[PDB]
Design a protein around this ligand. Structure first.
Ligand SMILES: [Cl-]
Length: 268
């Protein structure tokens, strides 16, 4: 007999009640193949969370462009937008593609992400990379900061929890990338600094976690995805996305962590 998904679902719905919006969750145990799925195929805005996949797409390009990663990008003030703490620091020198990638992933640097998007042929270039690995859901249409608008009903700049998790698995654990590039992606995710109150908060401290967050700043819209390695066990991949109907509904990191805990504990 199969899982009673109504029972697996119940506590996510209770969390939604107090939150005042929608929570989307997909979690996959790579050992057993067990999953937890709550609104997993609904669309949610990516916000900054596209930056993980951006870095993967950059790594993919580097496979065909030797020394791309150590190439300096030297930019002018037009590259700069708010929430770009690392790229702002290096305006007077420039940053290598690798540095930009790490900044986009680990500090969620906006300008760094726009610079790398330009390298890939814009939002459509990143979407094309995601199509190349079989992700038909992911869509990045706009740049920083407009991609964060998170307007209800807008499908631009969204994906699903399930597609995010599936794509993350392919890129971090599967062989979609060459092994050095795969390990570089994993290391960048592992060194994220912005995720300590989201999925990481649900995970025992001594288990390795790599994640990427997003916070649109409106419509209760915020998220995190991660790969989790429990010691001596097969890794877990999961995604937790929120949105809410009013512009002024607050996002909640606590809700994200609680949804992550519920997902992780429901596996098997
Ligand atoms: Cl400029």
């Amino acid at each position: 007999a199969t899982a009673l998904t109504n029972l697996v679902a119940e506590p996510f719905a209770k969390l939604e009640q107090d939150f005042g919006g929608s929570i989307g969750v997909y979690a996959m145990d790579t050992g057993s193949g067990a999953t937890v799925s709550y609104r997993a195929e609904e669309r949610f805005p990516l916000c900054s969370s596209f930056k993980g996949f951006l870095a993967a797409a950059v790594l993919a390009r580097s496979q065909q462009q030797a020394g791309l990663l150590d190439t300096p990008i030297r930019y002018g003030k037009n590259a700069l937008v708010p929430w770009s703490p690392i790229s702002e620091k290096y305006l007077t020198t420039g940053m290598t593609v690798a540095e930009l990638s790490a900044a986009a992933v680990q500090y969620s640097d906006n300008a760094a992400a726009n610079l790398l998007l330009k390298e890939l042929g814009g939002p459509a270039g990143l979407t094309a990379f995601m199509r190349s690995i079989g992700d038909t859901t992911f869509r990045l249409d706009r740049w920083e900061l407009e991609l964060n608008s998170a307007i209800p009903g807008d499908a631009r700049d969204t994906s699903s929890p399930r597609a995010v998790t599936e794509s993350l698995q392919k890129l971090t654990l599967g062989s979609a990338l060459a092994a050095p590039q795969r390990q570089q992606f994993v290391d960048w995710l592992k060194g994220n600094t912005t995720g300590n109150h989201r999925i990481r908060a649900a995970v025992p401290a001594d288990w390795a976690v790599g994640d990427k967050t997003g916070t649109c700043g409106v419509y209760g819209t915020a998220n995190d995805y991660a790969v989790v390695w429990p010691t001596g066990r097969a890794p877990i991949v999961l995604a937790v996305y929120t949105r809410a109907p009013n512009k002024d509904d607050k996002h909640s990191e606590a809700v994200i962590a609680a949804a992550a805990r519920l997902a992780l504990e429901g596996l098997g």
